Structure 1
Amino acid sequence: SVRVMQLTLGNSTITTQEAANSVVAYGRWPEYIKDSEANPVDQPTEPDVAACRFYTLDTVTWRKESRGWWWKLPDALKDMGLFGQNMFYHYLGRAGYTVHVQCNASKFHQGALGVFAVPEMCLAGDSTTHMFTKYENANPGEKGGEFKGSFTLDTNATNPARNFCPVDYLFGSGVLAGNAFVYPHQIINLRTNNCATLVLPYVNSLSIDSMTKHNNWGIAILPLAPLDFATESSTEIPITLTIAPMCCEFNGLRNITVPRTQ
């Protein structure tokens, strides 16, 4: 039925008994580069089962006060097994994804989470200096980031944070959040479903790019209807994020990249 599914990729399987169908972004399933759209001339590496499998990133907790969370792809998976290895050993890389967000509660809980997949999800910074966010802050990895309820300008001139300041109702980029529904999405309304499943093809203005310099997709999760339970002002339910890269192919092998951190 629309509600029961099983996803198998490599050596990993995911089962769900409360789905609300699955979304295939823009109606496009991920695919490899065709010869007619090929650019780099060298033989690509395609790890296949070693990289195209389900990786579970860290679990976040939803509370009445949560504003939202965000992650960047392939960034969030840079340290994930052999996918991360191939990402850093190659100059160029390409991949699609199957994003599976998990969140179960009970029949006496309420709340709705909007799960959006955004191509080129550029976020707003914290200073008066334009495009000032530094690489280390823009790429948090598997832990991702969070949305805020208001904009707060960083004034420390001696030691600028050079970080993002994504305000939730402004979708972290100066647009109204209610219009974010034009992007592939699903809603995890506690009275209806457990999860949200989105299949994302590779989207870019090029056939292949640098995975370290460029993040193709952004995953934004916003509480559309806040978490509430029985009468417990105190309520916490975890949100686990499991993502699997698809049709990975890398070009331009050399020595490994070791990016600067923190």
Structure 2
Amino acid sequence: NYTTINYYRDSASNAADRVMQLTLGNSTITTQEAANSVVAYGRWPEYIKDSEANPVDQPTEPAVAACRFYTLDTVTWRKESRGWWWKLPDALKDMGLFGQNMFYHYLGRAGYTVHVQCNASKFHQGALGVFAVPEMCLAGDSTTHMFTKYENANPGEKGGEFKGSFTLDTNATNPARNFCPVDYLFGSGVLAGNAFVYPHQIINLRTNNCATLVLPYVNSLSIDSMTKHNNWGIAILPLAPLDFATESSTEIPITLTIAPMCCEFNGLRNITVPRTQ
């Protein structure tokens, strides 16, 4: 036994599976070759509780008007693809009434259902790692730290691509001020092979055609500014390169469908019009 007694007031001073259907609003997704679906950290998206509400004004919950699947621009997977990234809610800023509520309010909160679709025949090869990264900070391309500008950090539904090797932006007069995400460094100075600590799913073309990730709202705050802060980052990397019948030049589309969930907005004002690239 030992005896412990606190001699101070403040406690700081104390000693230390395959067939699935997803319906949101007026949108429905059917899948037959699914590898199940992952709920990030086992937490389903939810609305702010009265015990955690910071803003006092009544929130607006568009529900089905905004809690529905929006499909982003399709990308092409080739043998030379290094990977793609999107930022949420940034990727949905021009998507129906969700983007309208996003830009008309000072504070916004939403979870997501991300559905990545990549169908290929039984004679194709390749694997895609689909990772949901909270606070997916990406490295810049200049000797100046944290120098990436807002326009490039928020590409929108197109997102960005990973790079095979790091290139330094030496243009002093007109710096690019863009990201330089290196695929094997995961764009953030960490080995990509460890990226599986994040919620993820692998689309192995021999097994499944799609991946589904249910992202809860993750943040150090109950609600934040959606225009300032991207809660999530979706990163897709080719773990196994695409291959097909030795024909070469094969390319298959990857489509991304994101549904915001449990959307809450506070602080209605005039609409925000961010500066464009």
**Both structures adopt the same fold (TM-score exceeding 0.5):** yes
d(CA) in 1 for partners of 2:223 and 2:81?
A: 36
**TM-fit CA distance, 1:143:** 0.4
d(CA) in 1 for partners of 2:112 and 2:185?
A: 26
1:182-236 Cα distance to aligned partner (Å, 9 max, x none): 0000000000000000000000000000000000000000000000000211101
Task: Give the TM-score of the pair, scaled to structure 2.
Answer: 0.94
Look up the SS of the partner of 1:170 in the other structure. Answer: coil
d(CA) in 2 for partners of 1:259 and 1:53?
A: 24
* Equivalent in the alignment of 1:258: 273
Task: Please tell me whether residue 151 in structure 1 is matched to residue 171 in structure 2.
Answer: no
d(CA) in 2 for partners of 1:126 and 1:23?
A: 33
d(CA) in 1 for partners of 2:86 and 2:159?
A: 4
**188-197 or 1-10: which moved more?**
1-10
1:63-88 Cα distance to aligned partner (Å, 9 max, x none): 00000000000000000000000000
Aligned-CA RMSD value = 3.0
d(CA) in 1 for partners of 2:247 and 2:130?
A: 25
Look up the SS of the partner of 2:250 in the other structure. Answer: coil
**TM-fit CA distance, 1:2:** 1.1
* Equivalent in the alignment of 1:228: 243
Look up the SS of the partner of 2:51 in the other structure. Answer: coil
d(CA) in 2 for partners of 1:232 and 1:219?
A: 31
- 1:111-260 map, 5 Å: 111-260=126-275
d(CA) in 2 for partners of 1:178 and 1:259?
A: 35
1:60-113 Cα distance to aligned partner (Å, 9 max, x none): 000000000000000000000000000000000000000000000001000000
d(CA) in 1 for partners of 2:173 and 2:86?
A: 29
Look up the SS of the partner of 1:142 in the other structure. Answer: coil
Structure 1 unaligned regions, length at least 5 = none
d(CA) in 2 for partners of 1:232 and 1:181?
A: 32
d(CA) in 2 for partners of 1:156 and 1:185?
A: 37
d(CA) in 1 for partners of 2:249 and 2:150?
A: 37
Q: Which stretches of structure 1, 4 residues or more, deviate above 6 A after TM superposition?
A: none
d(CA) in 2 for partners of 1:147 and 1:56?
A: 21
Look up the SS of the partner of 1:114 in the other structure. Answer: strand
In the comparison of the two structures, how many residue pairs are matched? Answer: 262
Look up the SS of the partner of 1:168 in the other structure. Answer: coil
- Aligned equivalent of 1:93, options 103, 108, 119: 108
**TM-fit CA distance, 1:38:** 0.5
1:101-134 Cα distance to aligned partner (Å, 9 max, x none): 0000001000000000000000000000000000
d(CA) in 2 for partners of 1:138 and 1:93?
A: 19
d(CA) in 1 for partners of 2:161 and 2:196?
A: 19
Look up the SS of the partner of 1:96 in the other structure. Answer: strand
Identity in percent: 99
**TM-fit CA distance, 1:139:** 0.2
Look up the SS of the partner of 1:36 in the other structure. Answer: helix
1:137-171 Cα distance to aligned partner (Å, 9 max, x none): 00000000000000000000000000100000000
Look up the SS of the partner of 1:84 in the other structure. Answer: helix
Q: Which has the larger radius of gyration?
A: 2
d(CA) in 1 for partners of 2:201 and 2:274?
A: 34
